Ligand binder design. Structure first.
Ligand SMILES: Nc1ncnc2c1ncn2[C@@H]1O[C@H](COP(=O)(O)OP(=O)(O)OP(=O)(O)O)[C@@H](O)[C@H]1O
Lengths: 240, 239, 228, 233, 240, 250, 238, 86, 146
């Protein structure tokens, strides 16, 4: 009876209703996944199609915060760009006072202290964005971290948010991940990406893919469709 | 339960804390006043004096200057606030530009200050009103009023409080244009309204008259005691 | 089910702004008229008792020398906007050596149309009729407490804004002279007043490039009265 | 209205009584017993600390936290908001000590703290202190024992008691303790009134007896507590 | 008793009780973890664990062991989101005392300065009480090791051996009888009793890689923990 | 946060101040004081709600609190709630001596403290002061003056007062006692004794539960006579013989 | 009903209704269709008036030289952002001496409206801005919503019953990329003519039109400026 | 606003109505009065008619009491429906 | 079952349902004559309803899509006259959250106005007229909102 009003108050069951509503708020958004190979980290984003809707290559949830770091985000898009600028401004403070690459561990920790703080106050509101953080460096290596709206900082080799299909991360164990060079990895993930998330719910869709690792020498950028072209090349013939 | 809004206001067409503050106005102490070419008269009653206390602490009339007189109706709590407030306002006005602005600066001060006093958050509107008394320059009278909404207005007659004090202003309209040509009858109007207004005790009644530019003094029970006797005689002349 | 009054209700829109529109019901009405020769505007003071002094309450004030204005609803609510708007046009003549004409006054007030807020205050329900003569000649503009400025050549406010404008929109055809609209307004005036027309009841606002200022005069207010 | 910066949450009941401040007295009543005695040379305090589990050692956490070398003190009821005003009193007692150059009396600690403690209750958005402080010490050759309350009202008692059944222990301290006695005799009846609501087991860690000497406050170790009270009182 | 909107904010009750604060009791239950502290003569040993629902779990990132100072570490319970915001505050005042004071840190009274910030969290108008539970060890000169467990009510608490949490209530029951009587404590004796006190609760007794045993003993005063090597040897040493 | 606000500052629908009406219910209870006109002096008396005899009474003046060597104020209400206003007005009385070097008159002294209590009532939603205290002193203009404070922010100043509950039988008797001033300072105190003896709940006129402080006008020291309770008992038994003499008539 | 009181509450479905209620203010605006081709862009709005004599309210207004925009919804919060829109324009025109690409420009507006949609007591901004501007890569058509999500497109339609324009667009908007300015404007108003009731005009002065290009500076076209655009067209069928 | 005279049309057959009465004049003075509150208009018309011993009721007669019946009955409650569901 | 009982207004049936659920549990022959259940809201659901003999097939019904909303309105009208000259695309996309039963009322209101119109023939614009009619809400318009 109103225990979900103030974000600064607990609940009769001893948890935060504001976070419980924030966890499923990210689930209604389209799927954005991530995975890390040995020398690199892979990102992906699904783009839903209802009517048209608009130009392809628009408002992609894939963003680039820093040289070696990138953003695979889900949920409300405007709240993601705000966290994109905060992570960009935080990356600007590190490159200024220090001048080298910001470690992914503490970069996620800075955002972990932010996302957690907004959930504590009833004035502001929690975040409806659950994103993926991953990076690779020559002196660090490939790490991937999963951040949740509750403010828990941690990471696995892979995680999945967005829509509830979750079958696109199943075939990854059926293929070589840490053994592969991250090159063929791009086209190996996209097979079931097309199969599952059936066309009954959404007639058409579109896929974005991004990668950062050794082949780019630590740089992060979205893999072009024309180069190396084998991304969507092998994806169409792997549906069976 | 309790369902109400505060500010502002209500779709029903009337405000909340404003017109309800008018109830805290009309419930104020009964007071009257008039304007004249020379001597302006005022009055106050319904102070509920028990005869056992000091009259100077319950005095309802102060003066910012000898030219301008203050008359208010309501609780005496916010009074000294405005007394401290307005006196510093007319002081800082006395400070620079020695010649003061005439009657349009001071009447819009408390009025506009009370209007913005209902504007910003954390400010509770005053439930009291006031009517400025005095004389304009070049021998003209000056009187105005304060409204909970901050609207300044000039009256030919001051009628507030109970329905008995409204008769005092009704008697002024019976003097038509010419009356009064003597100050005796103009003071006697307060001595006549003393019986009509309130409990007719002859105690809570107090008045002061400012003739032209001369600073008024509180009436001592000699003049007003002599004019109280002619008030009953003048009413007997009409019989 | 009152949430913050600023919170965009289920319908939805602001509560207090929706309330402040009803605040026009508690106050008098006016009638605007515009013509190529000049702009004439009329009002009614709504005298409750003879104790009311006519020059005490005036519903027409001139913001700038050539720019008149008309208030609505309460008085002191507009008085804060009225008096502060006079500072605007004067500083514009300081920087640019030219006064605001009929336009830069609008955007000045349009920027401050809604300044209200709870955190970081209360919006006024007073409608404003902006008259004046710009480089384009005599012009009359209108705005509402909601904050959206829409150009209204001849506009009426008050609780009579519904009825008074209905017959007024028909008579604004460009073939009508200014002199025909002057006597057309008093026809609606005598219908919307319960008390017989007297020198203290109504006032007029007329501004022209040649005749000024004007503003308005005294004893010429009573001439349009006896002609009723 | 206004900001939301925590305006006062304390209102007046139809009878005029305080709402949340009187509820803080329930925490004092639902707290732990603490007693003190002002007699003759100095003031003697007897508190009660019992471990809820056998794994708790009383040698670390100390109930008595003296404000000054010559000023002792104890508390009753509720810790978290208690240490806030304690350390605040440590910073506040310095202005009197630096400017006036003097071992500030307990009466001035009462005037300054209870004024801020009353201002703390007047400030809303925060729960009032549920701690009833017993202020003692020695000043101007004559010691003092003063009792405060969550509302800020300060009293003066020869022998006072707080906590569970404080009205019953107050009558015992009214009868068994009267006029004034030596500090040794003051420790005696201070433990006897503490053994009233105490359990059937009394050891060095179960009760701790503070004493304010004319030479200034000296906190007795659990050694002297088991030596005098064994064999309590 | 409850009257009005008191249920919807953090304040007292008509009976003087608390609701929000007492709803933080089960705020640890969603995490479902356990931490027990055992201290010896010259040593102190902490026992904890972690849950691995998926093979993607990284041992380093999901590690629940937090190190405040080289000489003094710590551990948390409950939801890990609120714990991390208290981690830097435990590091903050640490470095403040290392800088200004320049010695072994308030091994006793440090829980007062931490609980003060923890009370500010509770004393704030509208803010989350942060129900994470802080647990510290300690090292002092000729005082032996110290063990301290703080709770987010704003008070300082610590003793020889203390266990508080979901299932920690049954763990202290064995420690009361195990310590005394009369007994001493050696290095391996405290490590062996870390499991036996939990053996009175659950102790599924599986591969040690999931459980983490914190240990501090005075030889080199610096706190530290081994990896997987002899912890299993201490697990097979206690069982003969 | 609009529902959590109880609208303390804002008025009641009935025209009364909602917070102040429940405030003055505490003034009718708790503190009890009195005042009367007296020539070449002024007297003050109060009865303690702490009157339980287990206190040390080492505070000397308690309910009688003396703000300045030349001025005292009898307080009715919560002690520490009033103690915020004591030192405040004490500093207001002291800052007056700083920029002037002349004793603060009683008129503007009351209007200064009443506005401090009024500021919390008009805005901020803060808890208003439920303390109503008296005022005594002397000035070179109006001479002896008596005043009272109200929680709404108004000065309740008159030449007489009824505070806060009992003294009832003496109240109407004070209107028959309205004859203005006298001394013989012991005669005016004798009239105060029949008030404390007759109208007390346990009666008996307990000496330890009440304290009488009198201000005697003196040039230029203005000596305040604080009775040591040794001369109160003989002052109590002084009018008890007169009260026994007053009943000899009928 | 007690859990629906505040703004901070997420619905049992996890949606904040305050943004949805601000979406209603955008729908009540006039029907307007912004669009771009692969060469030149054309945006069209609709003027409304409360009374007959009242001049038709303008929507399309020029801000940047190469950036035209329409407006719908709350005018107050629009004029606020309008002064903020002029700011960032002259900012880069002063320090950088170059204009701002619409891509990164609108990213600042989305972040400007993020704070009022978060903190308690703050309100979102109903916004109907349809932005058309030219960076080095050509024209862009974005959208504006109280949720602060801008979508790059060739064309969009907002306002009252403006979804009917998209249905005319989806087939035509793909074929409108190759058409020069002349026929594009008259084909543009052909989309909004079914958005108005078919039984009445659709006059000259009740509609807003503007055109901007790489080498063409954006100019407001209204009243008689629409006469060459409305002439030489076919009426709607029955 | 133009429909308040329709409830006055059925009430124009009540008792004896003078031809000088204008129903459009008093309609605007009583907002949100429906047919119930203006049923009292023609009631207070005949009410004070017999109180004053007169027969018919002119417009100015009862409307002077109508401006009272709206305001004096709005002192305790102004009869809003907005606050019911809100 | 509320939380604190007893009891609700559903007493006889909440014992009846859990008895309807009981004979499915204790008695195996009850697997005969399958029973269909229907609810208008998921807010209150008894966890005991999960069983083979009890509720098994569960599919959440959201608001039908634009293709389905256009369909159902035509397939509810197969029993009656359907107006020609219909794109079916415009009436489909303009429907957001509108109920299927309200789509029947669209052809009702469009058929009710056909009376006063004098012609029983309807146009494609009449659909979207009655579609926006019933929802969102009725009947007012946006003013004073700037
Ligand atoms: N426009 C009107 N025409 C005729 N009579 C009217 C009109 N408006 C109101 N009335 C009369 O006012 C009287 C009072 O209505 P009443 O208060 O009984 O409605 P109600 O039944 O309470 O409404 P609800 O059921 O919504 O609460 C009715 O008897 C009705 O005849």
């Amino acid at each position: 009876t109103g225990y979900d009003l103030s974000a600064s108050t607990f609940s009769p069951d001893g948890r935060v209703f504001q976070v419980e509503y924030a966890m499923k708020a990210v689930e209604n958004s389209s799927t954005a996944i991530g995975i890390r190979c040995k020398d690199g980290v892979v990102f992906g984003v699904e783009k839903l199609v209802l009517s048209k809707l608009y130009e392809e290559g628009s408002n992609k949830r894939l963003f680039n915060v820093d040289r070696h770091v990138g953003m695979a985000v889900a949920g409300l898009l405007a709240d993601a760009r705000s966290l994109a600028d905060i992570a960009r401004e935080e990356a600007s403070n590190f490159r200024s006072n220090f001048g080298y690459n910001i470690p992914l561990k503490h970069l996620a920790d800075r955002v972990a202290m932010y996302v957690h703080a907004y959930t504590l106050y009833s004035a502001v509101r929690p975040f409806g964005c659950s994103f993926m953080l991953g990076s690779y460096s020559v002196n660090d290596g490939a790490q991937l971290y999963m951040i949740d709206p509750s403010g828990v900082s941690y990471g696995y080799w892979g995680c999945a948010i967005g829509k509830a299909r979750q079958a696109a991360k199943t075939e990854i164990e059926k293929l070589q991940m840490k053994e592969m060079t991250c090159r063929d990895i791009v086209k190996e993930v996209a097979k079931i990406i097309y199969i599952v998330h059936d066309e009954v719910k959404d007639k058409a869709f579109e896929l974005e893919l991004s990668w950062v690792g050794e082949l780019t020498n630590g740089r992060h950028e979205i893999v072009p469709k024309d180069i190396r072209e084998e991304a969507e090349k092998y994806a169409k013939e792997s549906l069976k | 339960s309790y369902d109400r809004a505060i500010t502002v206001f209500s779709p029903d067409g009337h405000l909340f804390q404003v017109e309800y503050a008018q109830e805290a106005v009309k419930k104020g102490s009964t007071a009257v006043g008039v304007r004249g070419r020379d001597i302006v008269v005022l009055g106050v009653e319904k102070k509920s004096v028990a005869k056992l206390q000091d009259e100077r602490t319950v005095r309802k009339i102060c003066a910012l200057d000898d030219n301008v007189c203050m008359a208010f109706a309501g609780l005496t709590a916010d009074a000294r606030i405005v007394i401290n407030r307005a006196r510093v306002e007319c002081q800082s006005h006395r400070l620079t530009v020695e010649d003061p602005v005439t009657v349009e600066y001071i009447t819009r001060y408390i009025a506009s200050l009370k209007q913005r006093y209902t504007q910003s958050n954390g400010r509770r509107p005053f439930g009291i009103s006031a009517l400025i008394v005095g004389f304009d320059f070049d021998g003209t009278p000056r009187l105005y009023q304060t409204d909970p909404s901050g609207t300044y207005h000039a009256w030919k007659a001051n009628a507030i409080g109970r329905g008995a004090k409204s008769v005092r202003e009704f008697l002024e309209k019976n003097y038509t244009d010419e009356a009064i040509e003597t100050d005796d009858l103009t003071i006697k109007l307060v001595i006549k309204a003393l019986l009509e207004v309130v409990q007719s005790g002859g105690k809570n009644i107090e008045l002061a008259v400012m003739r032209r530019d001369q600073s008024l003094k509180i009436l001592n029970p000699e003049e007003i005691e002599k004019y109280v006797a002619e008030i009953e005689k003048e009413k007997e002349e009409n019989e | 089910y009152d949430r913050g009054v600023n919170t965009f209700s289920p319908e939805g829109r602001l509560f207090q702004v929706e309330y402040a529109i009803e605040a026009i019901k508690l106050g008098s009405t006016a009638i605007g008229i515009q013509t190529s020769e000049g702009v004439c505007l009329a009002v009614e003071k709504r005298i409750t008792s003879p104790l009311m002094e006519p020059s005490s309450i005036e519903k027409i004030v001139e913001i700038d020398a050539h720019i008149g204005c008309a208030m609505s609803g309460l008085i002191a609510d507009a008085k804060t906007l009225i008096d502060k708007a006079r500072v605007e046009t004067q500083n514009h003549w300081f920087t640019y050596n030219e006064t605001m004409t009929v336009e830069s006054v609008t955007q000045a007030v349009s920027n401050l149309a809604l300044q209200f807020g709870e955190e970081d205050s209360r919006p006024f329900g007073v409608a404003l009729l902006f008259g004046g003569v710009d480089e384009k000649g005599p012009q009359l503009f209108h705005m509402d407490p909601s904050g959206t400025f829409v150009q209204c050549d001849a506009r009426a406010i008050g609780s009579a804004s519904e009825g008074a404008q209905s017959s007024l929109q028909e008579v604004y055809h460009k073939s009508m002279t200014l002199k025909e609209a002057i006597k057309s307004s008093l026809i609606i005036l005598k219908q919307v007043m319960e008390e017989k027309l007297n020198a203290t009841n109504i006032e007029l606002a007329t501004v022209q490039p040649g005749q000024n200022f004007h503003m308005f005069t005294k004893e010429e207010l009573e001439e349009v009265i006896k002609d009723i | 209205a206004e900001r939301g910066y925590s305006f006062s949450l304390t209102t007046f009941s139809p009878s005029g009584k305080l709402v949340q401040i009187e509820y803080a007295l329930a925490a004092v009543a639902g707290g732990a017993p603490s007693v003190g005695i002002k007699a003759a040379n100095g003031v003697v305090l007897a508190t009660e600390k019992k471990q809820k589990s056998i794994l708790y050692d009383e040698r670390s956490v100390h109930k008595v936290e003296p404000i000054t070398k010559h000023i002792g003190l104890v508390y009753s009821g509720m810790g978290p908001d208690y240490r806030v005003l304690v350390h605040r009193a440590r910073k506040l007692a310095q202005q009197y000590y630096l400017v006036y150059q003097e071992p500030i009396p307990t009466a001035q600690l009462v005037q300054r703290v209870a004024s801020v403690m009353q201002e703390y209750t007047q400030s809303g958005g925060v729960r009032p202190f549920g701690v009833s402080l017993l202020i003692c010490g020695w000043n101007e050759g004559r010691p003092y024992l003063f009792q405060s309350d969550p509302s800020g009202a300060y009293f003066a008692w020869k022998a006072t008691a707080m906590g569970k059944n404080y009205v019953n222990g107050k009558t015992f301290l009214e009868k068994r303790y009267n006029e004034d006695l030596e500090l040794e005799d003051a420790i005696h009846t201070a433990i006897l009134t503490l053994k009233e609501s105490f359990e059937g087991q009394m050891t060095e860690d179960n009760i701790e007896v503070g004493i304010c000497n004319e030479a200034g406050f000296r906190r007795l170790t659990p050694t002297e507590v088991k030596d005098y009270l064994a064999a309590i009182a | 008793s409850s009257a009005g909107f008191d249920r919807h904010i953090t304040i007292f009750s008509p009976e003087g009780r608390l609701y929000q604060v007492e709803y933080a009791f089960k705020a640890i239950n969603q995490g479902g973890l356990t931490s027990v502290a055992v201290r010896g003569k010259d040593c102190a040993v902490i026992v904890t664990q972690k849950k691995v629902p998926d093979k993607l779990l990284d041992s380093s990132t999901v590690t629940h062991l937090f190190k405040i100072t080289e000489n003094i570490g710590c551990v948390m319970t409950g939801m890990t989101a609120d714990s991390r915001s208290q981690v830097q505050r435990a590091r903050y005042e640490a470095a403040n005392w290392k800088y200004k004071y320049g010695y072994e840190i308030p091994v006793d009274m440090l829980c007062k300065r931490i609980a003060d910030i923890s009370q500010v969290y509770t004393q704030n108008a509208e803010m989350r009480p942060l129900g994470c539970c802080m647990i510290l060890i300690g090292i002092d000169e000729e005082q032996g090791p110290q063990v301290y467990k703080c709770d987010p009510a704003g008070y300082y608490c610590g003793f020889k051996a203390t266990a508080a949490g979901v299932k920690q209530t049954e763990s202290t029951s064995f420690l009361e009888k195990k310590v005394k009587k009369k007994f001493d404590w050696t290095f391996e004796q405290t490590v062996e009793t870390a499991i036996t006190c939990l053996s009175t609760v659950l102790s599924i007794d599986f591969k040690p890689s999931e459980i983490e045993v914190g240990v501090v003993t005075v030889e080199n005063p610096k706190f530290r923990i081994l990896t997987e090597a002899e912890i299993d040897a201490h697990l097979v040493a206690l069982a003969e | 946060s609009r529902r959590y606000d109880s609208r303390t500052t804002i008025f009641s629908p009935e025209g009364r101040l909602y917070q102040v009406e429940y405030a003055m219910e505490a003034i009718g209870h708790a503190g009890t004081c009195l005042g009367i006109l007296a020539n070449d002096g002024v007297l003050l008396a109060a009865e303690r709600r702490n009157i339980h005899k287990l206190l040390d009474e080492v505070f000397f003046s308690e309910k009688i609190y003396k703000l300045n060597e030349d001025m005292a104020c009898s307080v009715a209400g919560i002690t520490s709630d009033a103690n915020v206003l004591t030192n405040e007005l004490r500093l207001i009385a002291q800052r007056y001596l700083l920029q002037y070097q002349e004793p603060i008159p009683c008129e503007q002294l009351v209007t200064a403290l009443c506005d401090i209590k009024q500021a919390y009532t008009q805005f901020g939603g803060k808890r208003p002061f439920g303390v109503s205290l008296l005022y005594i002193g002397w000035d070179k203009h109006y001479g002896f003056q008596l005043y009272q404070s109200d929680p709404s922010g108004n000065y309740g100043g008159w030449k007489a007062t009824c505070i806060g509950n009992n003294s009832a039988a003496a109240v109407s008797m004070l209107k028959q006692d309205y004859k203005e001033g006298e001394m013989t300072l012991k005669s005016a105190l004798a009239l105060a004794i029949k008030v404390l003896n007759k109208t007390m709940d346990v009666s008996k006129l307990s000496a330890e539960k009440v304290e009488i402080a009198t201000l005697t006008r003196e040039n230029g020291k203005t000596v305040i006579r604080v009775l040591k309770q040794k001369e109160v008992e003989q002052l109590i038994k002084k009018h008890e013989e007169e009260e026994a003499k007053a009943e000899r008539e009928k | 009903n007690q859990y629906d009181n505040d703004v901070t509450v997420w619905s049992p479905q996890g949606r904040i209704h305050q943004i949805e209620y601000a979406m209603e203010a955008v729908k009540q605006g006039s029907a307007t269709v912004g669009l771009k081709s692969k060469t030149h862009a054309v945006l069209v709005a609709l003027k409304r008036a409360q009374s007959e004599l009242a001049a038709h309210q303008k929507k399309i207004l020029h801000v940047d030289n190469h950036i035209g925009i329409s407006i719908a919804g709350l005018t107050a919060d629009a004029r606020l952002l309008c002064n903020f829109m002029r700011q960032e324009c002259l900012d880069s025109r002063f320090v950088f001496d170059r204009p701002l690409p619409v891509s990164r420009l609108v990213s600042l507006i989305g972040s400007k409206t993020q704070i009022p949609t978060q903190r308690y007591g703050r309100r979102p901004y109903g916004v109907g801005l349809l932005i058309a501007g030219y960076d080095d890569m050509g024209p862009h058509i974005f959208q504006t919503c109280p949720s602060a999500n801008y979508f790059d497109c060739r064309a969009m339609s907002i306002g009252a019953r403006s979804q009917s324009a998209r249905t005319y667009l989806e087939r035509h908007m793909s074929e409108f990329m190759e058409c020069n300015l002349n026929e594009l404007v008259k084909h543009g108003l052909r989309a909004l003519r079914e958005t108005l009731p078919a039984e009445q005009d659709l006059t000259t002065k009740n509609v807003s039109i503007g055109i901007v290009g790489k080498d063409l500076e954006f100019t407001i076209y209204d009243d008689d400026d629409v006469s060459p655009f409305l002439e030489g067209l076919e009426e709607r069928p029955q | 606003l133009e429909g308040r005279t329709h409830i006055f049309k059925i009430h124009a057959r009540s008792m004896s109505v003078e031809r000088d009465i204008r129903f459009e004049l008093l309609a605007r003075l009583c907002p949100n009065s429906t047919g119930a509150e203006i049923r009292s208009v023609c009631t207070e018309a005949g009410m004070f008619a017999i109180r004053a011993r007169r027969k018919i009721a002119t417009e100015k007669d009862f409307l002077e009491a109508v401006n009272k019946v709206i305001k004096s009955y709005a002192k305790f409650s102004a009869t809003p429906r907005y606050m019911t569901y809100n | 079952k509320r939380f604190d009982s007893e009891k609700a207004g559903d007493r006889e049936v909440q014992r009846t349902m859990l008895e309807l659920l009981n004979q499915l549990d204790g008695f195996q022959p009850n697997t005969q004559v399958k029973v269909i259940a229907a609810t208008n809201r998921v807010d209150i659901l008894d966890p005991a309803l999960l069983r083979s003999g009890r509720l098994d097939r569960k599919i959440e019904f959201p608001m039908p899509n634009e293709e389905a909303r256009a369909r159902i309105m035509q397939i509810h009208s197969r029993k009656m006259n359907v107006s020609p000259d219909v794109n079916y695309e415009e009436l489909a996309r303009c429907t957001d959250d509108f109920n299927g039963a309200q789509c029947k009322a669209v052809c009702v209101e469009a058929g009710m106005i056909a009376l006063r119109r004098g012609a029983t023939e309807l146009t494609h614009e009449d659909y979207m007229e009655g579609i926006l009619e019933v929802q969102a809400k009725k009947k007012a318009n946006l003013q004073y909102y700037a």
